[PDB]
Nucleic acid binder design. Structure first.
Lengths: 102, 15, 63, 46, 77, 93
RNA sequence: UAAGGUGAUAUGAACCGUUAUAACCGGCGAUUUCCGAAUGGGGAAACCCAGUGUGUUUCGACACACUAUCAUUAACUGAAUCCAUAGGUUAAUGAGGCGAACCGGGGGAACUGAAACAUCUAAGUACCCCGAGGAAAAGAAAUCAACCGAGAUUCCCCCAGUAGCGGCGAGCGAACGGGGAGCAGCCCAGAGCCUGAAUCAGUGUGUGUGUUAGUGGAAGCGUCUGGAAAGGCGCGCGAUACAGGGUGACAGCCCCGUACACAAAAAUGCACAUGCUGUGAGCUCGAUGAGUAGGGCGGGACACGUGGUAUCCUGUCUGAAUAUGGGGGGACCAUCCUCCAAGGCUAAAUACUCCUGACUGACCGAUAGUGAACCAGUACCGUGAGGGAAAGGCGAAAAGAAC
RNA sequence: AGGACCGAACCGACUAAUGUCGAAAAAUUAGCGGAUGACUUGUGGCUGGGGGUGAAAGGCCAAUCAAACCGGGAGAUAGCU
RNA sequence: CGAAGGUGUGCUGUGAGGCAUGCUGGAGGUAUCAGAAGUGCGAAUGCUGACAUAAGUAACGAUAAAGCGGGUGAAAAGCCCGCUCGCCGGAAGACCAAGGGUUCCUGUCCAACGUUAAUCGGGGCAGGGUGAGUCGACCCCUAAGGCGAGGCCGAAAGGCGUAGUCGAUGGGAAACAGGUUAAUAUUCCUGUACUUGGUGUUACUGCGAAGGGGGGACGGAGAAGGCUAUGUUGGCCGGGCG
RNA sequence: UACGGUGCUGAAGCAACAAAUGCCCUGCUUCCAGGAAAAGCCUCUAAGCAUCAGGUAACAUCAAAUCGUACCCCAAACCG
């Protein structure tokens, strides 16, 4: 039922990183995906007294909405929408606009 | 917020 | 472990859940209170499987 | 001076306690009003 | 309460109208009495709190007949 | 029977404190949290079997939960009962 | 259904999974501490004390079940006197209590108006109590009408603020009839012939259909500005789908969705068909509701306040006829008309919304809107009944400020 | 012996001052009356709103009494402001 | 390439008002013509919230009273310790009952509380502490009184009341001394004891009621005697001779 | 001695007098106003059972459950 799953190579459609690519690390329950190399936030992390002293300004990956990204087709070289079909006994995702099987 | 004891009344007269 | 305890004999699986309480269920409760139990997911699953046998214990005995 | 409220748990429960309220028809209707209003503290009890 | 056994007469409310038509809420009471009637069936006496008009229902009927309706209504005669 | 099953639920946590540690070396008494609805016979029989030690007498008291405050919420700790289980000369744990 | 999850404040730790016994959703089951009708007894609620019968490692001492009241029925006993009853014991079934409004019944004010106030009105209103259902009540004429006729009850609009009632003051206020919704009639007071024939009720099966999980579900880019574009411009597509929401500013083609087309292992709602059981058909001849109608005294309700007052009900005292008889047709008499009491059941149109699902608003936008948009009947006040607040917004994303 | 006397605890409040937005929504200070009885007090009960209770002031009935408090008729009514 | 709102300016109409625009603000507003008002506040000793005023004024809450040195700390009149002064002492001391509910004790902090400061506290956070056969509660019983199977009465609700059942402020069984914790101690430890039940063994023996009887079981006041708690003195012991 | 306190050791430890509202005393006297109830405890038997069951004496053994227990308690902790 999820149009974008865990290990899908996606492309950002809207935001400051429009046109960049990258695979998703994880997706949250609030419709937020986490893709590396896209939402680089300069978090001023305080060094916890507990057993490690990172300090510095860390470079994390902020969450972005799943609606602003779409899975990369890697054949047409552009953004591609995804539907659902019943090609085998289970439900599987299939492409649109020169539809293929994922 | 409480009221006040009210001014002490004088002895009332008659005809 | 829904099927791995289903067809076992009544007092046979009764001994297991009576052993369940004799072990971890009581042993890990002593170790977690003394700050020696590193893992915390073990206490949750042991409470779950004790409830699993007691559900099957009532299912096998009588109705 | 002697204040009008001299507390006593025994006299409090004997007058406005739960079992005192349930001992009469009208006291039961008090609880119905409290439950309709959804008040947490129903009577004076422990 | 003031309830007749046979007829079922109970007190009713009304107005105590005066000469100036002042309405005062009063209560009409039945003429109940505790009379023990002889029953030839059981050869004993059965005491009842019946009305004076209720006894007039009793004597025109049978004493064993009127107790059947009391037994049917679920009354302890 | 299920008497031994009850003893496996009476014991809750081995209590430790400055007073409880002194009870070990001097008074030979273990201090440990028990069930709220636990009697002296139930506590004694649990330590007899589950700990393989000789229980002389068990003294219990109910600890009242302190009324704490998590910010603006008025909370209250759960009440619990501690046991002063005195062992004999041949104690192990 | 599923590649993500171990509810939230609220991270973290330790883990469970990745096409299947992770999690989630629903159906069916199990568990369901104590109080509370509480129901073993008691009691200051979440407490104390038991009794009986069974099953059991140290007589140690535990485990389970039962034991409340009342009503009905059955069985066994059983006085004061023989019998017998009252009473007692046991067994079975039902009830007890809670719940917003609607309904029926039993009680029932005053403030107010009359410019006072007692008749009256307010008002059979507020309130108290009892009872029942999903609707409740009533309900198939001893009815209306007029000497033409209509034919159960219930609800809406006229009739009509009319006729009337009323310190004829204030005020109260019809009926007849008509137009509509919805229309369903039956059983006993009794015997025979025929007996299960319509009829409903209780349980199974079959089919249809709905609910409780859900599935598929269309269609776009470039470029400009802008932090970010859905916004401007340009050129396309879908549309039984621009209902709606979210997406870094206003998106039909980014997503959730929507129209439309589908789906139920299991549990049921409803509609019939049908199996079984109970139930009672149809015809003939009868019967056809007594301390009742009515009357006297005193009230109540009918718009009708006793007035010339018809009608019904009732506290008390009386009291017929009985279908060749009686009631009503508004004091009452005679004639005609009509109906049949003193025994009962009944769906529909009718009222309400504690609660659930969907949708809408020339309703509010935080002193408003429910008292409460923020863990509100909460904090707080009062012994108690009860009263009762204030308190919304950083940012797109915490990236919430390393040093 | 004493509803005896003086006088502590205790009960009460006669005089004066202070206090009158007070330390206190009747108290303190200095004196006062009873102080073995019709005394005082603790605890647990009973009597309630046209009612209770009153060695009786129309006093008390939870700091409110010629008819307590709360909720409801009720947005009573007001020729008045 | 900047809506509404806010805040200024310049014009404009007889007027309620209108237009343009500087700045902030940040995403909504709305021409013209019609329609519907929760449609225009200075007053109601109007309601809610905020801020002035008197004014840095009274007061800082019994006239029992503080003075000094050292310590801690950024800061000491108020905290800690030591040396002097004063107050209560039939209490302003030490135990309880009722009533409160962790205020107890330790570590740590001075944002809010304390009518001043505060490293201080009954203030915030965290941790610990409440040990019973002999104390009390529970339990046996009962007074006043409550409920009340049946029963009587009452329109309903319900009222009274028997058996019974509750109901202490009363009657019933039993432990003292010493020591110990930062906080518990007739409860913990040591010493020495006491009471009530169950079971088993032995030896005798008739036991046995919601029943009878005894006892429990009782008023005020007064006086005397013997005592004791306790106090004083002497003796004894230890220290001293300033 | 972390200087808070801890460990060890430890003499005398008697007599006389005074003396209570406290004890004997729920006593005695006196007075009138005439001064709770039931349970525990002792005893007796009824219905019943007697080789029993039960009761008394001695010994051994077990058990005495549950809850309250900190602190203020004439007060900055209760009511105001």
């Amino acid at each position: 039922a999820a149009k974008i799953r865990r290990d899908d190579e996606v492309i950002v459609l809207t935001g400051k990183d429009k046109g960049k690519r990258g695979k998703v690390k994880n997706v949250l329950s609030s419709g937020k995906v986490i893709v590396e190399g896209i939402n680089l936030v300069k978090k001023h992390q305080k060094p916890v007294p507990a057993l490690n002293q990172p300090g510095g300004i860390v470079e994390k990956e902020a969450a972005i909405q799943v609606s602003n990204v779409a899975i990369f087709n890697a054949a047409t070289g552009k953004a591609d929408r995804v539907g659902f079909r019943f090609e085998d006994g289970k439900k599987v995702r299939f492409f649109k606009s020169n539809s293929e099987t994922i | 917020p409480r009221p006040r004891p009210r001014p002490r009344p004088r002895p009332r007269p008659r005809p | 472990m829904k099927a791995k305890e289903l067809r076992e004999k009544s007092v046979e699986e009764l001994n297991t859940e009576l052993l369940n309480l004799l072990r971890e269920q009581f042993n890990l409760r002593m170790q977690a209170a003394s700050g020696q139990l590193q893992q915390s997911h073990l206490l949750k699953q042991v409470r779950r499987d004790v409830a699993r046998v007691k559900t099957l214990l009532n299912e096998k005995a009588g109705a | 001076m002697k204040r009008t409220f001299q507390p006593s748990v025994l006299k409090r429960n004997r007058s406005h306690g739960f079992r005192a309220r349930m001992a009469t028809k009208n006291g039961r209707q008090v609880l119905a009003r409290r439950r309709a209003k959804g008040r947490a503290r129903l009577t004076v009890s422990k | 309460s003031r309830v007749c056994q046979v007829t079922g007469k109970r007190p009713v409310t009304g107005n105590n109208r005066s000469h100036a038509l002042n309405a005062t809420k009063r209560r009409f009471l039945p003429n109940l009495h505790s009379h023990r009637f002889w029953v030839e069936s059981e050869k004993r006496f059965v005491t009842l709190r019946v009305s004076a008009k209720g006894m007039r229902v009793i004597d025109k009927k049978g004493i064993d007949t009127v107790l059947a309706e009391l037994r049917a209504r679920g009354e302890k005669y | 029977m299920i008497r031994e099953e009850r003893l496996l639920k009476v014991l809750r946590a081995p209590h430790v404190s400055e007073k409880a540690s002194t009870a070990m070396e001097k008074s030979n008494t273990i201090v440990l949290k028990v069930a709220k609805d636990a009697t002296k016979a139930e506590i004694k029989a649990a330590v007899q079997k589950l700990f393989e030690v000789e229980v002389e007498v068990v003294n219990t008291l109910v600890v009242k939960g302190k009324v704490k405050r998590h910010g603006q919420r008025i909370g209250r700790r759960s009440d619990w009962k501690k046991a002063y289980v005195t062992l004999k000369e041949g104690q192990n744990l």
